């Protein structure tokens, strides 16, 4: 498809790479935010027992 149409295929593959990069970054961001906001209730209280 690159030999057929170079510009269309390079912009589609650039879009796919951008989409997977943004998806991975956003998933990591939500995972880190969830871990942060679920360990701050228990990092501030050492004597408490984590379920």
């Amino acid at each position: 498809y690159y030999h057929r149409h170079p510009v269309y295929t390079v912009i589609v593959l650039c879009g796919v790479a951008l989409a997977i990069l943004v998806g991975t970054a956003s998933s990591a961001a939500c995972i880190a935010k969830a871990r942060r906001d679920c360990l701050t209730p228990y990092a501030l209280a050492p004597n408490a027992t984590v379920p």
């Binding site: 906001d37 701050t40 209730p41 228990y42 990092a43 501030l44 209280a45 050492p46 004597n47 408490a48 027992t49």
Partner: protein
């Protein structure tokens, strides 16, 4: 009792103009309010990294090598009423914190509340305003031990 025990435990924060908040060392961790700004004193303890818990309006971090004699353990057990305090006495009626009107104010954000045995039970961050018994917005610990944020309506943080 309270004044002697809170000495060399409540570390004032300076905004380079005046004291404007207190940072407390409890359970082997430093914690200070977010909304207070400036530089903590005790330059040994000023150099530690503090990570932000914006949910509870705090910055907390691991204390330096002073494990022993600087614990100041907290208590999740909260019998109602008659607790001592830096500026006087607080009350734990109906699950809230009440003080006589006129105490506290700007520059006093972060002082702890101690029990009869001296163990810390609560660290305030702001206050509401009822006509006679002023309320306090505070970081406490639940009956399961997890930390909670008790804030009444219209809590001025100062």
């Amino acid at each position: 009792m309270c004044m002697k025990l809170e000495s060399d435990k409540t570390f004032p924060i300076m905004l380079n103009g005046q004291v404007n908040g207190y940072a407390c060392v409890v359970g082997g961790r430093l914690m200070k309010p977010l909304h207070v700004e400036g530089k903590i004193d005790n330059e040994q303890l000023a150099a530690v990294k503090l990570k932000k818990a914006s949910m509870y309006d705090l910055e907390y971090g691991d204390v330096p090598q002073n494990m022993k004699s600087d614990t100041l353990q907290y208590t999740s057990d909260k019998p109602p009423g008659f607790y001592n305090w830096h500026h006087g006495a607080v009350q734990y009626e109906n699950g809230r914190f009440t003080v006589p009107r006129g105490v506290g104010g700007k520059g006093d954000s972060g002082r702890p509340i101690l029990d009869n045995r001296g163990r810390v039970v609560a660290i305030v961050l702001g206050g509401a305003n009822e006509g006679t018994r002023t309320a306090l917005s505070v970081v406490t610990w639940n009956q399961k031990g997890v930390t909670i944020k008790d804030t009444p309506e219209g809590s001025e943080p100062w």
